[PDB]
Amino acid sequence: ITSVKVVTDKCTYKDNELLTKYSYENAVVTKTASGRFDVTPTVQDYVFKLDLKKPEKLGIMLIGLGGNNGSTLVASVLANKHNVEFQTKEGVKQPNYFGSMTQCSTLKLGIDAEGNDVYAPFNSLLPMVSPNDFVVSGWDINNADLYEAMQRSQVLEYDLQQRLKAKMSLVKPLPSIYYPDFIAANQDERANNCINLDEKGNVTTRGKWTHLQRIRRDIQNFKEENALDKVIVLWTANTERYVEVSPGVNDTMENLLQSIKNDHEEIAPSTIFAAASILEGVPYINGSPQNTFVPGLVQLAEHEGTFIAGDDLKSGQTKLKSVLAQFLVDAGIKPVSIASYNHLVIDDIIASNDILYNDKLGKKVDHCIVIKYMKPVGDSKVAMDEYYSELMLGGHNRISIHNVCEDSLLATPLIIDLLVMTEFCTRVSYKKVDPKFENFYPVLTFLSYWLKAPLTRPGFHPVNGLNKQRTALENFLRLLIGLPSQNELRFEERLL
Amino acid sequence: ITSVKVVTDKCTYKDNELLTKYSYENAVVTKTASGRFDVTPTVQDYVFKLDLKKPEKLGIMLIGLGGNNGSTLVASVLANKHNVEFQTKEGVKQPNYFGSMTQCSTLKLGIDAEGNDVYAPFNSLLPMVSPNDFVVSGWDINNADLYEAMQRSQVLEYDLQQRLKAKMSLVKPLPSIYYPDFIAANQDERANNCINLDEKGNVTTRGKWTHLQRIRRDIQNFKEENALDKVIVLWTANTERYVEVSPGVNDTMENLLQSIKNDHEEIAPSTIFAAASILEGVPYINGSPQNTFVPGLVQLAEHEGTFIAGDDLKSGQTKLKSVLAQFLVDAGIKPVSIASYNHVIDDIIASNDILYNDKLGKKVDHCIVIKYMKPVGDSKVAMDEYYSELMLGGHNRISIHNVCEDSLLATPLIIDLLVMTEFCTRVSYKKVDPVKEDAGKFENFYPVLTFLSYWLKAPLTRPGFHPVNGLNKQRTALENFLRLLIGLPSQNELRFEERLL
Amino acid sequence: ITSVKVVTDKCTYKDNELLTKYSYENAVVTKTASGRFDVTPTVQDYVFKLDLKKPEKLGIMLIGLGGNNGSTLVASVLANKHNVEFQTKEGVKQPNYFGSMTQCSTLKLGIDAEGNDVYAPFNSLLPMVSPNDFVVSGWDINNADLYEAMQRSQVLEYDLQQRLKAKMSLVKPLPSIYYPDFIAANQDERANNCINLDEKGNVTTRGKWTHLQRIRRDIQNFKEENALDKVIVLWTANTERYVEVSPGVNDTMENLLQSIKNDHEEIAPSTIFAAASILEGVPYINGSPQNTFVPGLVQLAEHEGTFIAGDDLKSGQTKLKSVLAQFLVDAGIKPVSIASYNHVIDDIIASNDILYNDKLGKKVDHCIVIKYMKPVGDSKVAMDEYYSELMLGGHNRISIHNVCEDSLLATPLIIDLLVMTEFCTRVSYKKVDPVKEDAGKFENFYPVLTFLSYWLKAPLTRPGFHPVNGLNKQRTALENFLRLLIGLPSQNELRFEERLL
Amino acid sequence: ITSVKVVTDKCTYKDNELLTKYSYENAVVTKTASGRFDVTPTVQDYVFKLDLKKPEKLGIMLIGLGGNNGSTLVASVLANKHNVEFQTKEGVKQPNYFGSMTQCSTLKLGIDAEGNDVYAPFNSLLPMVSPNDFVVSGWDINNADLYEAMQRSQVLEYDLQQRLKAKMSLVKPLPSIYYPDFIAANQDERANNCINLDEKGNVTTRGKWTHLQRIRRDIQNFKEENALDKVIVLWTANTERYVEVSPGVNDTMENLLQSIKNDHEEIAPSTIFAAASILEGVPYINGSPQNTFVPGLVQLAEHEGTFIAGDDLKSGQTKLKSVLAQFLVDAGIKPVSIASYNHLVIDDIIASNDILYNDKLGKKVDHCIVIKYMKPVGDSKVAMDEYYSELMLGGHNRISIHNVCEDSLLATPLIIDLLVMTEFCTRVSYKKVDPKFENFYPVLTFLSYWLKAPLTRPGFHPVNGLNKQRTALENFLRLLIGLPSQNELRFEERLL
């Protein structure tokens, strides 16, 4: 029952609508030889419309529903929504969405009477859907029910597992599409739930269009049988091999549709699901590396006017490593080598500093990531990062970090955050006010804080500096309610 | 030379000074029994003035000049000032200031000819004094010349020390003030450079007001002997013991000044220096944990219009904790335990009651351990263990191990404070009225320069207010302040010309 | 069932007992002003006798029975004895004794049909009593039944505890002896199971000799109620404080016995148990750091012919330090500093004066840090930093971080001690004369069973001798002793049929 | 001036000779189905002859002289031999061979009067050569003098470097043989010191026999010009690609000689050096992985009656990891996964225990080693090992170890130990006394503690358990002086 009402003339509330004005400021720079940056500022006005009518229940279809994140994600909503307390060594525990930014982080609205900061919930500024108001379903090439999937995953406490048994046992993933030549082969001891078959059972790559049709049906059917209107699809399945974006097949929307029709080799399963999600209007989020959103799939989006992902879920490991890495260069410390070893954004940093990273001294940072397979750990992901930096006058700093957690209990909550923010971003439209009222960008570029390969538009360097990404996000919600950026100048203190 | 010319009608240049208009917005909030935050914005206009004429030489006087940092400080200046390369098992190295945020750090000025961020050196926005212009000197309870101090310290490359030897030798710290009972006895047979001595050259905590007058004279002599105009004083000496703040004694200006004239067992060596520093109009920075800025001393700083800095140099293991811990609470992760070993997060446990409350708990186990081991040397080895909670019973154990040479990290931070406070001393502002044109004369930063908390463990903030420690937040303020002065808004980090086509 | 029949004329079997001949060689050495070691060999013949009839049930009584280890101890026995699988987020697990050197460890019997080492279970050489035959009981200053103890302890799988619940509940520790001043007050409101009470049921360190007689009776009752013959007592209770050994008091047998009858402020709870244990002829093992085996108590053990064990359970972080540190000095590497953090190597710094001497130095900085943090639970996190020296100025920094659940490591070690001491109680020897056939009657191990030092931090050795801590060395002795008893020589590890064709 | 004189009738000293008798004991086992190991003991008598005449100066020729170990190894002997104290941050330091077992470890001879252990130097039992009595030379495809090689290597303090400049600058590696197709290609920016050339300069593979001849010459020349008789050669160069051991070429001694003559493709540079060392009688030690000692090269050895290596120098990293690994299984702890990440013996452990490692529970241990290249560390080798074990009743132990050192200052001293032990082993011969007097085994199998791939004879499992390897070694020196094995029974204590 938390709310935020901001005394501002910049916000006008209409018919379950919200229009806010926003003077956006920035500037352009140009370094001359003489060693002087000329800075010319640039303002552009906007007006955002926020459809305050949020779904009483958001539909959620995960592609890879029976996986680790899939199963736990379902268990969480169930455990939380229904308040299932569970037993452990340390005693009974109460469900929650720890690790989830929207559900458990907080923001500063301003100061109180004494001059001290006041914090409010991330999701208490503007209305947002609650994961408990999620209705989940999805596909998976393996038919085990979400209870067996839980067991198999070994990520949840055995008590919190049994208490959910009954409810978890009723959930079953819809058969998925299985073009084997696109995943890490030998996922055949698993595939026993496919819609892509031929007259004689066997898995087939022929019929790529009917396969598409069948996903749209499952979407329609899901939306209908559950009586939902809003629904989001998240690919949280196997990582597929990329596909060649060659003209005549992957480029323009028409060719793509056609190529799916032609059963073309370059049409991956994630490709179908995507197109299928668009032709049905549901936002699609690709939480894996593969270049799903190829040119053609990106257009069929702009066209149908639906929203899309940013490629690859950013692990809580890549995040932390990005912060620290940023932390160092900020301080004026030149890391010179950074290694990662994990068994279950640097190049641009180098760009921000020409003091530390130049030719006379060297503008190179050694780095390497290593992911090894070790079954005997039980979901528990172990990652270790070694940073070697150069302090002044011959000095050196060595920070070795050893991170360890249940991996999924860290990934699941971030999946939720993407869903909640994707849905929220859906109800936002804008326009260059000016001294139509078009939606956002088909590419939801405010969800980068959760995506490792921030899908962007041409000639643009997506940024990473984690807290920057979270600040952009915070600063968005704020502008939406008539609040400016956080300046941290605390002048009612520094000043008399 | 790195320049940054910003085009705006908010900045005017008159008589070697910069005049920048600024509209400081903020907002006040109020909760409700029903749990509603009523946010009511706040705008207040200002007109800042930056004396552009930065001093040609910045006089600097350290207390603990012969210590690890004090000597390393002087070394680095000599090294960088005279580009003295040196030999390493790695080869000929060049002098630098890595670790110096004001020297080796960059701020973003915006985007370029295509939406690609453009950074400039932190020290390039507005004119700042460079460490290569510092005129270091100071005091120390030991007469060891700075060269000996280097050897004794064991921080710099033997070849480097060798190259600096000749010059470093001529630098000898002045006698300080030794009041035995304010520190340790292991550091007693080290005091052969004191000024509190009776006819029988023996330490005596009697005659304090005389010492107070002596230190003040030191400052004066230093100034004129180098032909300096500005001087900053920084206590980087040993850690004293807290002083019991009692009424009538050090609770108010005059009383402190008297408790001094009275040789009170509460007047510490630093207090004399602080008072001395203050009474001479030179800023004073407490780089040690002890609370030298007792109420009375602070009131003196106000009456005088001198600056002072929030206690204890924020090291590296600490800096990295208000980064690591922040990050975790910012992602909805609940750290439940934290242990620091080696040989403030309160404003976080409180910034989220979703995490910390009566139901789920609000206690976070922190515990530091600082054992000594002479072997390792100036190579402190810090180890931190973070045990946070994840949803549904899981946990996250982030154990960081980090070794390096403090003095090398601590010396540039000290260089930073100095550059930054000298900078602040040239900035004056003026509250402005939207209707009444020109409504005020300029003032100076409230004496307690909190713009320096980035480099300080226990931020010394004015009564009533709470000290914020978020490192990223502390830097931002430094940054927006500098932008603000050249006509740029705060960083919004939105990039709406990429997110919004 | 694992057997190991060795063929040799050194072993004879008569009347449920094993008779093995053995020639114990050793050598005495002497240095010289010129630095010459004159090594003069030593041979002494023996005839060992091993009562093969091991007890059908081994009575075991713990002091701290409701503690983390005591309860885990009983759990594991119940679990393994009745093969009680349990559920984990990993699946149905089977009970075991991993961590138990006598149960899950193997000894090499030699080579096979081709020079390929053949190992057999440590407990297979000679008959040893299995933990599944222990009859656990004991005392505790708190009446919490063992099931509650489990919950309270938080060491075992919730499902496991649940399965053991019904049986674990019926196990309730006997009242112990509480002498407030010998430990901590935080552990005072926990004492609701005491036997030292006046008419006003209040703790009283008066009547000690009565308590002494009470404990002795406990032992007796335990025995007959279970139909046991052998019983071992192990103190795994809280850590008391050392007792000032003073003449006339606890310096000699009778005096101790009197200082007891006299209620002396030096007689501790453990002392009463030790004396009680001893006076009843049951071996006694001190699994805590305090020195309960004062001279007088030891002399009592001699007069009585009972066994006793060297103070403090050698944990995991420790075991791994007398392995890591050994290894380094054995390779000519000189460790100069060592730090142990968490929430004896003397006989190494001395085993090499090439490394440690007046020239190069002989001081190694060690320093432990044991801070408490309730969050992490029974999951102690140990961190060790080793900073050794390498030739020509280099160094080697080996920093190990290791987390696990003590009780899980400490419980099998306790099982080991018990199996091992019960074993020793059945072994008797006899010094033999090479010329005079049959020259002696059998004796028993000198009361202070040092064969158990493998599992003990502060080895309690007999006066004059020094306590050796090399872990590998401690195990070897255990091993060669067992081999020796089946007719095998010590391990030479030469493999001359591979090195010498 | 330390010595050890043992009162024993087992040792008789003749003409600068030493003959000791040794009753060697062991036993044979055979596990029957019923679950019973039958143990039949087996004794074999021996008599070793130890030629007490040690070289007043041992010659040392390193193949790869200008490398890291090469240069430092030379610097150490020089620094120590000449007592060159050097300056550092912590002040003047005195040279020493720390890390060297023979030169700095110690052994127990027995107890003293009170019953307490007495220790003596590893090299104070029987006479052994001192590294200061080494005269070094060798080959290297790069001609830089050992001073430049020092600098390049960045392993030694800059003061201890300059003090050695003069002496180090006079040492230059003899040109080596350079068949590029055998090493990690592109070692051409280095090779500028080769004997294998043709009429027109360029490196060549043709003439493999003359190349051999030329090494023997350098050996003869070195031995002669320095007036030495004893000399050992140690390959401490690049790791070569293995070679196929095919009959008709690598098998019998004759074919090998012939194949070298035929310029056969399967004849590597290390192959030449080896054969060349043998045909000259000098022991050869291969401190690298490549299968140098192929069948043919092993015979030409037995034949010429010279001694050979054991393949690959055992790093102080593999050692420690082996101890700990052993430590665990000894305690009864079942490690289940062990990873290694290093950027600059398990299978048999699994065999020793069928309790912990069987089928019903699983007899597999996950493991992996990862060596990445990171130039910005300066010789400093960083290695990290993670062990995950299973304690009882659901428990788990996790020991993560982070090792760091100058790498070479750790490898060099072990090279010395091999040289000192190889030389010592040379002066040892034995015979199966019996109720000729042939030398050892061409394969010096007592130097395993220093070799990672203990070269052995057919159908034999070389052992590793580090301290076992060191004990065998200790137990050898002991038998040589009439002392038995260390039993640790301390009966003048346990017993009355």
Curated annotation (Swiss-Prot), chains A, D:
Reported induction: Induced by valproate. Repressed by inositol.
Keyword Transport: no
Subcellular location as annotated: Cytoplasm
Regulation: Competitively inhibited by myo-2-inosose 1-phosphate, which is also an intermediate in the catalytic reaction. Competitively inhibited by 2-deoxy-myo-inositol 1-phosphate (dMIP), 1-deoxy-1-(phosphonomethyl)-myo-2-inosose (DPMI), dihydroxyacetone phosphate (DHAP), 6-deoxy-D-glucose 6-(E)-vinylhomophosphonate, 6-deoxy-D-glucitol 6-(E)-vinylhomophosphonate, 2,6-dideoxy-D-glucose 6-(E)-vinylhomophosphonate and 2,6-dideoxy-D-glucitol 6-(E)-vinylhomophosphonate. Inhibited by 2-deoxyglucitol 6-phosphate (dgtolP).
Any GO CC annotation of this UniProt entry: cytoplasm
Inactivation phenotype: Inositol auxotrophy.
pH-activity profile: Optimum pH is 7.2-7.7.
Sites of Phosphothreonine modification: T40
Binding positions for NAD(+) per the UniProt entry: 66-69, 140, 176-177, 187-188, 190, 236-239, 287-288, 312-313, 315, 378-379, 407-408
SUPFAM superfamilies: Glyceraldehyde-3-phosphate dehydrogenase-like, C-terminal domain, NAD(P)-binding Rossmann-fold domains
UniProt keyword Repeat present: no
Enzyme Commission code: 5.5.1.4
Record's comment on post-translational modification: Increasingly phosphorylated in presence of valproate.
A molecular function GO annotation: inositol-3-phosphate synthase activity
Phosphoserine, modified sites: S169, S176, S288
A Pfam short name: Inos-1-P_synth
One GO-annotated biological process of the protein: inositol biosynthetic process
Pathway this chain belongs to: Polyol metabolism; myo-inositol biosynthesis; myo-inositol from D-glucose 6-phosphate: step 1/2
Family to which the UniProt record says this protein belongs: Belongs to the myo-inositol 1-phosphate synthase family.
Purpose: Key enzyme in myo-inositol biosynthesis pathway that catalyzes the conversion of glucose 6-phosphate to 1-myo-inositol 1-phosphate in a NAD-dependent manner. Rate-limiting enzyme in the synthesis of all inositol-containing compounds.
Protein name stated in the entry: Inositol-3-phosphate synthase
Gene encoding the protein: INO1
Swiss-Prot record, chains B, C:
Protein keywords: Cytoplasm, Inositol biosynthesis, Isomerase, Lipid biosynthesis, Lipid metabolism, NAD, Phospholipid biosynthesis, Phospholipid metabolism, Phosphoprotein
Residue numbers bearing the Phosphoserine modification: S169, S176, S288
Top EC category: isomerase
Cofactor(s) this protein requires: NAD(+)
Residues that, per the record, bind NAD(+): 66-69, 140, 176-177, 187-188, 190, 236-239, 287-288, 312-313, 315, 377-378, 406-407
SUPFAM superfamilies noted in UniProt: Glyceraldehyde-3-phosphate dehydrogenase-like, C-terminal domain, NAD(P)-binding Rossmann-fold domains
Observed phenotype of the null mutant: Inositol auxotrophy.
Main location: cytoplasm
Regulation: Competitively inhibited by myo-2-inosose 1-phosphate, which is also an intermediate in the catalytic reaction. Competitively inhibited by 2-deoxy-myo-inositol 1-phosphate (dMIP), 1-deoxy-1-(phosphonomethyl)-myo-2-inosose (DPMI), dihydroxyacetone phosphate (DHAP), 6-deoxy-D-glucose 6-(E)-vinylhomophosphonate, 6-deoxy-D-glucitol 6-(E)-vinylhomophosphonate, 2,6-dideoxy-D-glucose 6-(E)-vinylhomophosphonate and 2,6-dideoxy-D-glucitol 6-(E)-vinylhomophosphonate. Inhibited by 2-deoxyglucitol 6-phosphate (dgtolP).
Record GO terms (molecular function): inositol-3-phosphate synthase activity
Phosphothreonine sites (modified residues): T40
GO BP, one annotated term: phospholipid biosynthetic process
InterPro entries per UniProt: Myo-inos-1-P_Synthase, Myo-inos-1-P_Synthase_GAPDH, NAD(P)-bd_dom_sf
pH dependence: Optimum pH is 7.2-7.7.
Known EC number: 5.5.1.4
Consequence of changing S288 to A/D: Decreases activity. Inositol auxotrophy
Subcellular localization: Cytoplasm
Pathway: Polyol metabolism; myo-inositol biosynthesis; myo-inositol from D-glucose 6-phosphate: step 1/2
Inducing factors: Induced by valproate. Repressed by inositol.
Processing after translation: Increasingly phosphorylated in presence of valproate.
Substrates-to-products reaction catalysed: D-glucose 6-phosphate = 1D-myo-inositol 3-phosphate
Biological role: Key enzyme in myo-inositol biosynthesis pathway that catalyzes the conversion of glucose 6-phosphate to 1-myo-inositol 1-phosphate in a NAD-dependent manner. Rate-limiting enzyme in the synthesis of all inositol-containing compounds.
Subunit and interaction comment: Homotetramer.
UniProt-recorded name of the protein: Inositol-3-phosphate synthase
Taxonomic placement: Eukaryota, Fungi, Dikarya, Ascomycota, Saccharomycotina
The encoding gene: INO1
